[PDB]
Ligand binder design. Structure first.
Ligand SMILES: [Mg+2]
Ligand SMILES: [Mg+2]
Ligand SMILES: [Mg+2]
Ligand SMILES: [Mg+2]
Ligand SMILES: [Mg+2]
Ligand SMILES: [Mg+2]
Ligand SMILES: [Mg+2]
Ligand SMILES: [Mg+2]
Ligand SMILES: [Mg+2]
Ligand SMILES: [Mg+2]
Ligand SMILES: [Mg+2]
Ligand SMILES: [Mg+2]
Ligand SMILES: [Mg+2]
Ligand SMILES: [Mg+2]
Ligand SMILES: [Mg+2]
Ligand SMILES: [Mg+2]
Ligand SMILES: [Mg+2]
Ligand SMILES: [Mg+2]
Ligand SMILES: [Mg+2]
Ligand SMILES: [Mg+2]
Ligand SMILES: [Mg+2]
Lengths: 68, 208, 157, 169, 294
RNA sequence: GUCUACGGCCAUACCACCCUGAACGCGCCCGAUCUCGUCUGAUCUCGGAAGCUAAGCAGGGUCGGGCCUGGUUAGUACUUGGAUGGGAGACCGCCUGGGAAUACCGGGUGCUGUAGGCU
RNA sequence: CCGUGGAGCAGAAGGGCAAAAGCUCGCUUGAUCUUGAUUUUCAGUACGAAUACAGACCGUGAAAGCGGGGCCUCACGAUC
RNA sequence: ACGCAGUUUUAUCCGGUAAAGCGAAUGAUUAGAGGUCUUGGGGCCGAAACGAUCUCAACCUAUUCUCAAACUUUAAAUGGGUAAGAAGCCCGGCUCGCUGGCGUGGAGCCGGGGUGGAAUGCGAGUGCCUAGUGGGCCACUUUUGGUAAGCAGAACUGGC
């Protein structure tokens, strides 16, 4: 009652029935896995960007609109 | 002794005597030179060698029988110390045997189908030289007849060629007598040493 | 039944080739590995700590994370189902740069300089990389000598 | 007519290899203490014989290296015992020579009844200014070819100083 | 006839390294001293390299790039008579002096002169360099011992002490300075200040002037043949540290050239080599023609 | 035209032998009282400066051994794809493309960064 | 004195290693506690093993740094 | 114009098979020559003596014969990954509790400038539910075991 054990015949033809797909697109890539000390940098940097970017960038926009 | 009809042209990877075999018996042939072993280079001018045509395996017992037949014809033709024969081929491939009936079905099927080492054969490429005989200039036909007698005993189809080279060395017989006397080649027993010009000057000072 | 452990076929691949057995050079360390850098993977037998796997040798990936004395690389590995982007942590000794992206940035800088010259001087420059064109109707020279007659040699063993 | 290339006494080795450990080896270390005025150092295995009873990691031999004027004095005592007559095969091909003595009380030692009669190996090496190159930790360089000490230079040194005899037989 | 010494050993000989065959590196310590952690991506790692040679000590601070090592500042021992120390150029006192000169010259190059004065009064205490907030921070550097064995009393630690008292924030321990007892764990600062000022070699000069003047005339000759007396040495190093701290600017030499050059033999050409071989061939054939008859 | 300290390239830069080295510099060297660790100041540390380039070191040379590079081997051994090609088979030949290595011979044997000093 | 791994690295082999990962000496348990991520067989599930991290207490070292077991490849186990 | 490809090209890495070699490491293996260090066996000068010498073995040197799926200096063809742009460059400025000589470095955020950036073909992405399948075979080429099989077992592609 010996049977055929293992083969990879008729496998690439099944693979190319659907055109094997790259993930091909991740705009603004996934962030998990990166260094937790770098995350402790980046989250506080982002929320203080939300806090204190207003007036200096506003005056810089006024200055660059006056210059050009 | 199984016939040579079941051990023939190459089908397996080379399986030599090594750390992994450990069970091969001794080969049939042990010696390879039968003529004047201590001959010089200038004694026997010409040589004839035996070229294979089929990519086959030659057995050590066939090499034994062929060197015995060639030695017998050489000592009948040109006598003792009138020739120098060298079997260029060396057996290293070890065949395997799967013996049975050891008249019943009740010993083993194809359960463990691995072979014990039976004998030693030699894989021969197309154009590889089997034997080479160096002799005098007057013994041209006798080398041809000896290799013809060995042709009927080796299996397959193979041809003969009287070499352009001066015996076993890789240098030409036309340039030999013009070049061994002046500068380069010095005899070293039966072999020939070729000296380049990229040596220390002390060798050239010891020469000349 | 091949007993798929780790590095079961690496008698030659994780070895130093010839006249290179010894301590590692320091220019392997003294490199700039930032995010987005396209790097290659080449295994080293000297440092037995952070070699990736026998499957990722010779592959090419993108850097996402950099740490104290290693780096993090995403690699498109092909398996039975579909190719997958996989996040690996590889040490610095196993990783070199890829010169293909540097050559592409050199070509982009040359295209920018030629585009600035085109906007300055009104010259249509044909900045697209065309492939190898067919040869034009050029002209040969055979003066002084007749063309040499060749015939095949006879067979000599 | 030779710039500062003078052969000198680099060191002097003292070795006693006792066939067993314990009292006789301790008294041999006491003899080397009586010669040198400093403590010896013991030796050990890398071979086990069993034909006479030594084991692995036993104190088999005592040895001591002496340098300087004390080395010159013990060399003077050894050449006084041999009466300045070496043989030709004592000189090695590297320029160093050993001879060894028996009856260590001949060196000028009052014989004690408790110690016994020991023999003592004498091995002399020769030195030149510039042999610290292969020994210093920073730049371990070669000695050289015109600087190394040879058989002929060693035997002519022993002919010149101390008035020695070659004994070619 | 004996051994099979060198047939393919020259063909399979793997050379170690250029600097290792010269005997100047080890790289088992350099691979951990030099290489910066990759979280910073550009930040240079500053290393004070202190090398001791006969008649000259060298104190530098350098970092690494892939093309080589970039030296920011460098001090030497042969420039100490310009600052006051005429003789005694390879002692613990000149090691501390060269370390202080290197630290002051580095901070003069960076422009951090008015802040971070360091330890002015040399006492030999464990005055570690602190960082003042609201100001540019301290200079973080790390030692290089090289191939020298680090034992208590090695003057690479004296150059370290000079750097720390000059104001370089280098982490170190107090159990490798000279004066640290090997059995008792306490450290003595008076012995260390004494060994900085060099009062022990003053006591040895007193020992030579009292016991045997033959050795005092044999060695220490440049000392007594310009001037050395211990009260002037104790005042001399004290004035030399202030002479360092008042002017570390490193005035240079013009040197420009007197352009003349013939010292070294050049290589001979291929045709010249082959014609030397041909002259050897012709001379040996002339010898075979002549000496066989004569 | 050079050397020293740290190096990058890791034998075009190693090994054997023979010559050359003016000025700095490198060293061998002169000795253990303090710091130091050993049987031994031989090794490591400590304060030098009476000699020397004999050695280390820097150059040059050996029809030098190795290394690298280039011809020959060689469009040869191999090889993607093809045939109702040959041959009983063993293998071999052709179309289209790619195409390696040893003996043999010729050429080289260090290039450079930072900082510092001598003609 | 020559000595490029021709020895040794606990064991079967392969890779790697010379002021070393080998031998000797001095201290020490980082063979510690905790949360995530990734690789390996893979269905991209688990176990086991491993890697880079992060937070405490530390050991060694002059410091750089190294160490959360064995130079790496195996030496081990679900519900109740 | 967004984008994709069982494809090629342009650059960039990766491998260790075919081949070839072992006068190159490891393992085998053949024969001759030269040399004198060494012990082992014969012979001569002869009380005996490395006192001298003939012969042999081993060793070394330079050669030479033949190989290795579990050897390799070298090293193919075929093959695998990546890039061939607006998600890409350049300029200016804020934030950071990460890092730190330095407004030093690195990440994030904001504003502005120019899209004609290899060939060929194709209009693409994505979600849910589920049947059947889980006994295969044959053919060129590369191979494992066996003497061989219409035998048993693998790789690519094609067919039943
Ligand atoms: Mg089935
Ligand atoms: Mg393989
Ligand atoms: Mg160290
Ligand atoms: Mg003392
Ligand atoms: Mg003491
Ligand atoms: Mg001394
Ligand atoms: Mg000289
Ligand atoms: Mg010298
Ligand atoms: Mg030379
Ligand atoms: Mg040469
Ligand atoms: Mg084909
Ligand atoms: Mg040696
Ligand atoms: Mg092993
Ligand atoms: Mg090995
Ligand atoms: Mg160590
Ligand atoms: Mg931690
Ligand atoms: Mg092959
Ligand atoms: Mg259904
Ligand atoms: Mg089948
Ligand atoms: Mg069946
Ligand atoms: Mg059909």
């Amino acid at each position: 009652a010996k049977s055929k054990n293992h083969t990879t015949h008729n496998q690439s033809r099944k693979w190319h029935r659907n055109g094997i797909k790259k993930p091909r697109s991740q705009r603004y890539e996934s962030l998990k896995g990166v260094d937790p000390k770098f995350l402790r940098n980046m989250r506080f940097a982002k929320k203080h960007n939300k806090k204190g970017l207003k007036k200096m960038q506003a005056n810089n926009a006024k200055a660059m609109s006056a210059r050009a | 002794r199984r016939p040579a009809r079941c051990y023939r042209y190459c089908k397996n990877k080379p399986y030599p005597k090594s750390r992994f075999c450990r069970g091969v018996p001794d080969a049939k042939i042990r010696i390879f030179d039968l003529g004047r072993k201590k001959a010089k280079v200038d004694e026997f001018p010409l040589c004839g060698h035996m070229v294979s045509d089929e990519y086959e395996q030659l057995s050590s017992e066939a090499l034994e029988a062929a060197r015995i037949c060639a030695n017998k014809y050489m000592v009948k033709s040109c006598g003792k110390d009138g020739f120098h024969i060298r079997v260029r081929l060396h057996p290293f491939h070890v065949i395997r045997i799967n013996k049975m009936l050891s008249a019943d079905r009740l010993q083993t099927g194809m359960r463990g189908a691995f072979g014990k080492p039976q004998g030693t054969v030699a894989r021969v490429h197309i154009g590889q030289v089997i034997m080479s005989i160096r002799t005098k200039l007057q013994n041209k036909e006798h080398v041809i007849e000896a290799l013809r007698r060995a042709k009927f005993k080796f299996p397959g189809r193979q041809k003969i060629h009287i070499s352009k080279k001066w015996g076993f060395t890789k240098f030409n017989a036309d340039e030999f007598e013009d070049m061994v006397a002046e500068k380069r080649l010095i005899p070293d027993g039966c072999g020939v040493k070729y000296i380049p010009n990229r040596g220390p000057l002390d060798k050239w000072r010891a020469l000349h | 039944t091949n007993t798929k452990g780790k590095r079961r076929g690496t008698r030659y691949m994780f070895s130093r080739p010839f006249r290179k057995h010894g301590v590692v050079p320091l220019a392997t360390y003294m490199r700039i590995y930032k995010k987005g850098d396209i790097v290659d993977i080449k295994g080293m037998g000297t440092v037995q700590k952070g070699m990736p796997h026998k499957c990722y040798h010779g592959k090419t990936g993108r850097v996402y994370n950099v740490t104290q004395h290693a780096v993090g690389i995403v690699v498109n590995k092909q398996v039975k189902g579909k190719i997958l982007a996989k996040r690996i942590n590889v040490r610095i000794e196993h990783i070199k740069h890829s010169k293909s992206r540097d050559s592409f940035l050199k070509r982009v800088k040359e295209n920018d300089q030629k585009k600035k010259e085109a906007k300055e001087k009104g010259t249509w420059v044909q900045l697209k990389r065309q492939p190898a064109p067919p040869r034009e109707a050029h002209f040969v020279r055979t003066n002084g000598k007749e063309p040499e007659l060749l015939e095949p040699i006879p067979y000599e063993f | 007519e030779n710039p500062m290339r003078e052969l000198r006494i680099r060191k002097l080795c003292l070795n006693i290899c006792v066939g067993e450990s314990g009292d006789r080896l301790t008294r041999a270390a006491k003899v080397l203490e009586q010669l040198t005025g400093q403590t010896p150092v013991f030796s050990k295995a890398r071979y086990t014989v069993r034909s006479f009873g030594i084991r692995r990691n036993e104190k088999i031999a005592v040895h001591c290296t002496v340098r300087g004027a004390k080395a010159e004095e013990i060399l003077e005592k050894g050449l006084k015992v041999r009466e300045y007559e070496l043989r030709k095969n004592n000189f090695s091909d590297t320029g160093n020579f050993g001879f060894g003595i028996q009856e260590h009380i001949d060196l000028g030692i009052k014989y004690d009844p408790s110690i016994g009669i020991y023999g003592l190996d004498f091995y002399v090496v020769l030195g030149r200014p510039g042999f610290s190159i292969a020994d210093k930790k920073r730049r371990t360089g070669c000695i050289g070819a015109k600087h190394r000490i040879s058989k002929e230079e060693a035997m002519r040194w022993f002919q010149q100083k101390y008035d020695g005899i070659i004994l070619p037989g | 006839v004996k051994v099979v010494k060198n047939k393919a050993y020259f063909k399979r000989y793997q050379v170690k390294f250029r600097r290792r065959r010269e005997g100047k590196t080890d790289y088992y310590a350099r691979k951990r001293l030099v290489i910066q952690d990759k979280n910073k991506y550009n930040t240079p790692k500053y290393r004070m390299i202190v090398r001791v040679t006969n008649r000259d000590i060298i104190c530098q601070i350098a970092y690494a790039r892939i093309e080589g090592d970039m030296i920011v500042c460098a001090a030497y021992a042969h420039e100490l008579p310009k600052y006051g120390v005429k003789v005694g150029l390879t002692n613990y006192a000149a090691a501390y002096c060269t370390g202080l000169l290197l630290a002051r010259r580095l901070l003069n190059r960076f422009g951090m002169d008015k802040i971070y004065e360091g330890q002015v009064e040399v006492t030999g205490d464990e005055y570690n360099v602190e960082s003042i907030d609201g100001q540019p921070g301290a200079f973080t550097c790390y030692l290089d011992a090289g191939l020298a064995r680090t034992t208590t009393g090695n003057k690479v630690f004296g150059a370290l002490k000079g750097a720390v008292d000059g104001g370089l924030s280098i982490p170190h321990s107090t159990k490798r300075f000279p004066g640290y007892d090997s059995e008792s764990k306490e450290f003595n600062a008076e012995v260390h200040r004494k060994h900085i000022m060099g009062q022990n070699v003053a006591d040895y000069m007193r020992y030579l002037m009292e016991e045997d003047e033959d050795a005092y005339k044999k060695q220490f000759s440049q000392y007594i043949k310009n001037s050395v007396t211990p009260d002037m040495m104790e005042e001399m190093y004290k004035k030399a540290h202030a002479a360092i701290r008042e002017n570390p600017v490193y005035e240079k030499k013009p040197k420009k050239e007197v352009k003349k050059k013939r010292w070294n033999r050049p290589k001979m050409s291929l045709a010249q080599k082959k014609d030397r071989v041909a002259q050897k061939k012709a001379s040996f054939l002339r010898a075979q023609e002549r000496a066989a008859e004569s």
